[PDB]
Amino acid sequence: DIVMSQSPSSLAVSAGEKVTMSCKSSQSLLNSRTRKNYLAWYQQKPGQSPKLLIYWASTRESGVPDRFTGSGSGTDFTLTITSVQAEDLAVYYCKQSYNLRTFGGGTKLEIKRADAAPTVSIFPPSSEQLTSGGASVVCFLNNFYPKDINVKWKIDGSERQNGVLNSWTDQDSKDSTYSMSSTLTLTKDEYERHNSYTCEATHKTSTSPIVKSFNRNEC
Amino acid sequence: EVKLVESGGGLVQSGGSLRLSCATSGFTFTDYYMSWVRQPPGKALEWLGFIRNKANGYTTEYSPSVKGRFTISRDNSQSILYLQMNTLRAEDSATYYCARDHDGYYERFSYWGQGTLVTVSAAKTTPPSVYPLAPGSAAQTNSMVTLGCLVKGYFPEPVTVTWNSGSLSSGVHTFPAVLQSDLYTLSSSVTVPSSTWPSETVTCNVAHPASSTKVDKKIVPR
Ligand SMILES: C=CCO[C@]1(C(=O)O)C[C@@H](O)[C@@H](O)[C@@H]([C@H](O)CO[C@]2(C(=O)O)C[C@@H](O)[C@@H](O)[C@@H]([C@H](O)CO)O2)O1
Numbered sequence: 001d002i003v004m005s006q007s008p009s010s011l012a013v014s015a016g017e018k019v020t021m022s023c024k025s026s027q028s029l030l031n032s033r034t035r036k037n038y039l040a041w042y043q044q045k046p047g048q049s050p051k052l053l054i055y056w057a058s059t060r061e062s063g064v065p066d067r068f069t070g071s072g073s074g075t076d077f078t079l080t081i082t083s084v085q086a087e088d089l090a091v092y093y094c095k096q097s098y099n100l101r102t103f104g105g106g107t108k109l110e111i112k113r114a115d116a117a118p119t120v121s122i123f124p125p126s127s128e129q130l131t132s133g134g135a136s137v138v139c140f141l142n143n144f145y146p147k148d149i150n151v152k153w154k155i156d157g158s159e160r161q162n163g164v165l166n167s168w169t170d171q172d173s174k175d176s177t178y179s180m181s182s183t184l185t186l187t188k189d190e191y192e193r194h195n196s197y198t199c200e201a202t203h204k205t206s207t208s209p210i211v212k213s214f215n216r217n218e219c
Numbered sequence: 220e221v222k223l224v225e226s227g228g229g230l231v232q233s234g235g236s237l238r239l240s241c242a243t244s245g246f247t248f249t250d251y252y253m254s255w256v257r258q259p260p261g262k263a264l265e266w267l268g269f270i271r272n273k274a275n276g277y278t279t280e281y282s283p284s285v286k287g288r289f290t291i292s293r294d295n296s297q298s299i300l301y302l303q304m305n306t307l308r309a310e311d312s313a314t315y316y317c318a319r320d321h322d323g324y325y326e327r328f329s330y331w332g333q334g335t336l337v338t339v340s341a342a343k344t345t346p347p348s349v350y351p352l353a354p355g356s357a358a359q360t361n362s363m364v365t366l367g368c369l370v371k372g373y374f375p376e377p378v379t380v381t382w383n384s385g386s387l388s389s390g391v392h393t394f395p396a397v398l399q400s401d402l403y404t405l406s407s408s409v410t411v412p413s414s415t416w417p418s419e420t421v422t423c424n425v426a427h428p429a430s431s432t433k434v435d436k437k438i439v440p441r
């Protein structure tokens with residue numbers, strides 16, 4: 001049993017700045033015979049498979065940008081990223097191969113950027129859903145930062161909280177923003193009892209909520 | 220080009236068995252140890268086991284977490300790696316990756332497959348309903364226009380969504396599925412110049428492998 005531990009669990013760094021993260025092993029990974037530390041680093045970008053960055057603690061794999069440097073020895077190892085780029089958003093894992101293999105628990109790197117307001121769009125239920133007796137209303141809140149955001153649904157001017165589900169994307173690898181979807185699902189019978197459907201987004205970028213609405217009579 | 224492609228993932232009941240495969244090309248297969256690694260949704264990688272290269276007699280080793288229950292094997296004539304899993308439980312639900320491992324010298328996993336997702340559950344396979352998301356009575360004259368597709372009520376994961384067969388990749392956001400009442404729902408938005416829709420077609424392409432569902436949904440104004 002070789003226990004691998006990483007720190008921090010997560011952090012956010014602005015483009016251009018330095019990133020430092022740590023990996024500890026419960027026993028030395030320095031192989032006596034070869035005089036090398038059997039410790040590798042992997043980068044896993046959102047939605048992708050892990051990719052090899054560094055092995056033998058400090059050897060940078062071909063094709064990996066030189067801003068990535070592995071260091072350390074024995075029980076303590078460090079991955080340093082200089083001049084971090086938006087595309088470096090990922091979970092970083094260390095892995096020992098001294099005795100079988102074991103991964104650390106990962107360090108999640110987020111990218112800090114300037115606050116950005118969401119672009120909000122609303123969509124009424126499709127006729128192909130209504131035909132089956134259901135009515136989902138969808139709101140997209142796209143390209144905002146930071147991740148914290150509030151969405152309220154109002155139906156004929158009254159807030160409704162039940163039947164609402166939200167889902168955030170991972171941070172974008174190009175512009176470092178988030179997006180979120182909010183979907184309000186009703187029955188057709190209830191949908192047909194009301195006219196105005198509104199999604200309201202409140203984000204730190206404005207004291208004014210962004211309001212998008214449609215009226216059933218206008219469909 | 221080195222390629223590793225896993226197959227065999229899907230829905231299986233607790234207590235059941237499932238065998239995964241990993242087809243490889245672009246390197247001398249027998250020269251390499253091969254590993255399996257898994258990852259529960261949103262959690263860490265976990266090394267499962269390896270099978271050694273020809274020089275080391277193709278012998279196997281396993282993590283204590285699966286030793287006695289999972290078996291690794293390899294077809295050295297076709298360059299395919301296998302993982303047999305038995306007595307599956309919910310904790311085994313994960314993306315399974317094959318990885319190229321040691322060649323007798325280098326200490327690294329050089330290459331990884333795309334992964335195959337295994338779901339251990341008693342719930343039944345349900346294909347998605349796919350609904351178009353077109354603007355209602357909005358201005359539309361807002362320079363850009365955002366369209367979407369709602370992929371509702373399916374099980375198990377995953378689904379794939381593309382737009383115009385992958386030709387539209389910029390300005391696409393596919394929102395992670397959320398589970399409710401034993402069913403997943405996700406949505407995908409795409410943002411394009413208003414000068415291109417509806418004058419040009421925009422179609423979402425949805426697949427749900429568990430039900431072999433293939434859907435192409437044209438977003439039509441209305
Ligand atoms: C006993 C020395 C043998 O060294 C070699 C060899 O000359 O055949 C070369 C090593 O690189 C290594 O392959 C070993 C042996 O096969 C062990 O390799 C493993 C293993 O358990 O199979 C795998 C390696 O990744 C590494 O973990 C080593 C460990 O450093 C012990 O040697 O074990 O054979």
Ligand SMILES: [Mg+2]
Nearest residue numbers: 143172177179
């Ligand atoms: Mg975006």
Ligand SMILES: [Zn+2]
Nearest residue numbers: 278279280281
């Ligand atoms: Zn052994």
